[PDB]
Design a protein around this ligand. Structure first.
Ligand SMILES: [Cu+2]
Length: 105
């Protein structure tokens, strides 16, 4: 895979690592729809609203299978550690109008 998953479960926003690279989700959108990170960086999404959201990378993007993240409730977080340079598009499973990408460089 081109990502590893610290926690299969969402976790609390206060449990996000110090100095984490955070993408907030609010207004049914990713607030940073294009994020550039380095190989080895961990990205953390944090849902800032009540409606549940996830991140979903279709098959072939981060690995052979789709990486369908867990649904995050308000003030829950989810992290992925990116291990290979490339451009990785994602969307929210129930809300596929909401799209983003991580560019790993
Ligand atoms: Cu959503």
């Amino acid at each position: 895979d081109k990502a590893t998953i610290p926690s299969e479960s969402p976790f609390a926003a206060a449990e996000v690592a110090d100095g984490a690279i955070v993408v907030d989700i609010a207004k049914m959108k990713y607030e940073t729809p294009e994020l550039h990170v380095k190989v080895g960086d961990t990205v953390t999404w944090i849902n800032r609203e009540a409606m549940p959201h996830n991140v979903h990378f279709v098959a072939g993007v981060l690995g052979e299978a789709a990486l369908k993240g867990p649904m995050m409730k308000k003030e829950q977080a989810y992290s992925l550690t990116f291990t290979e340079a490339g451009t990785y598009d994602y969307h929210c499973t129930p809300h596929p109008f909401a799209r983003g990408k991580v560019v790993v460089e």
